[PDB]
Amino acid sequence: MQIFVKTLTGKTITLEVEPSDTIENVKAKIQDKEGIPPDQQRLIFAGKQLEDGRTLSDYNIQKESTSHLVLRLRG
């Protein structure tokens, strides 16, 4: 499935993922496109920060017809 990530400029990128993928795995894909290491990424979905050891399904991100996440820089 596809997800959209609002980057630090207010623009977006797209990632291809699976619902059971871990948050850490998603951050690795964001690092590939944006050059921000996973330890400096904060991902927000539906107002909640996503935890590295959790999966996308833990947050029901796949239930939305369009999956919208927001990237913030730690610090």
Residue numbers in the entry: 1 to 75
Give the exact sentences the study uses for this entry.
The Ser/Thr protein kinase PINK1 phosphorylates the well‐folded, globular protein ubiquitin (Ub) at a relatively protected site, Ser65. We previously showed that Ser65 phosphorylation results in a conformational change in which Ub adopts a dynamic equilibrium between the known, common Ub conformation and a distinct, second conformation wherein the last β‐strand is retracted to extend the Ser65 loop and shorten the C‐terminal tail. We show using chemical exchange saturation transfer (CEST) nuclear magnetic resonance experiments that a similar, C‐terminally retracted (Ub‐CR) conformation also exists at low population in wild‐type Ub.
Therefore, we mutated Leu67 to Ser with the prediction that it would encourage β5‐strand slippage to place residue 67 in the Ser65 pocket, and fill the Leu67 hydrophobic pocket with Leu69 instead. Indeed, 1H‐15N BEST‐TROSY 2D spectra (bTROSY) of 15N‐labelled Ub L67S showed 73 peaks implying a single Ub conformation. The chemical shift pattern did not match wt Ub, but more closely resembled the pattern seen for the phosphoUb‐CR conformation. Hence, Ub L67S predominantly adopts the Ub‐CR conformation despite lacking phosphorylated Ser65. The structures highlight important consequences of the Ub‐CR conformation. The Ser65‐containing loop (aa 62–66) protrudes from and lacks defined contacts with the Ub core, is flexible judging by B‐factor analysis and in Ub L67S adopts distinct conformations in the two molecules in the asymmetric unit. Unlike the common Ub conformation, where this loop is predominantly in the “out” position and Leu8 contributes to the Ile44 patch, the β1–β2 loop is in the “in” position in Ub‐CR mutants such as Ub L67S; in this position, Leu8 contributes to the Ile36 patch. Phos‐tag gels and mass spectrometry (MS) showed that PhPINK1 phosphorylates Ub L67S at multiple sites, on Ser65, and on Thr66 or on the introduced Ser67. Consistently, in a large‐scale mutational study in Saccharomyces cerevisiae, the Ub L67S mutation was shown to have detrimental effects on yeast growth (Roscoe et al, 2013; Roscoe & Bolon, 2014).
